[PDB]
Design a protein around this nucleic acid. Structure first.
Ligand SMILES: [Zn+2]
Ligand SMILES: [Zn+2]
Ligand SMILES: [Zn+2]
Ligand SMILES: [Zn+2]
Lengths: 86, 86
DNA sequence: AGTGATATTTACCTCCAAATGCCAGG
DNA sequence: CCTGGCATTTGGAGGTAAATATCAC
């Protein structure tokens, strides 16, 4: 059900039904503002087993499915956990 | 039911006792007004669903007799404060 | 190193008890 | 005007969603 691997998902993460591996991958990439390189055509297949093959095409898929970078906490919300008051 | 006072169906505890909806209002409206009741007879009058309105004094007498509390009725400041308290 | 599972943290959402009030009838 | 059935509030137990940090491999 994970919108990127097809692996098992149990809840929405950053606005998309995602697995627990992509959730952790998306956060670290956005938190460290990391940059990747696709050694291939700039498009690599991403499924459960090959998700850890081209990190670039993986993150390219996280955006294409709509994971919002700004949900990854920062500023005076750095290290704040749980639901937000609203 | 379970009403300690008259024996009708009892929904939950009221002022310390598992009481009626009728005995709830009768106790509340009295302590609100602080009205004094008179029993024209022995001070022993029967109490059940069909005959609870016959003697007001005895109905209130039985209310204190089964442990209903005057302190729980809200007056002074909590006049109207609804629901449970912090 | 990253990866991914796991635990900690938050704040709503629904019951649910028990307080108040407000009328439709007797 | 007295009765009592119904409605409107409070807040705490208990569960859920979705942020985080914390590791073992
Ligand atoms: Zn996934
Ligand atoms: Zn690629
Ligand atoms: Zn009763
Ligand atoms: Zn009497």
């Amino acid at each position: 059900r994970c919108a990127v691997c097809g692996d098992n998902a149990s809840c929405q993460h950053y606005g998309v039904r995602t697995c627990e591996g992509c959730k952790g991958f998306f956060k670290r990439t956005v938190q460290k503002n990391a940059k990747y390189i696709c050694l291939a055509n700039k498009d690599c297949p991403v499924d459960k087993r090959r998700r850890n093959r081209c990190q670039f095409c993986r993150f390219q898929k996280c955006l294409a499915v709509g994971m919002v970078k700004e949900v990854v906490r920062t500023d005076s919300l750095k290290g704040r956990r749980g639901r937000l008051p609203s």
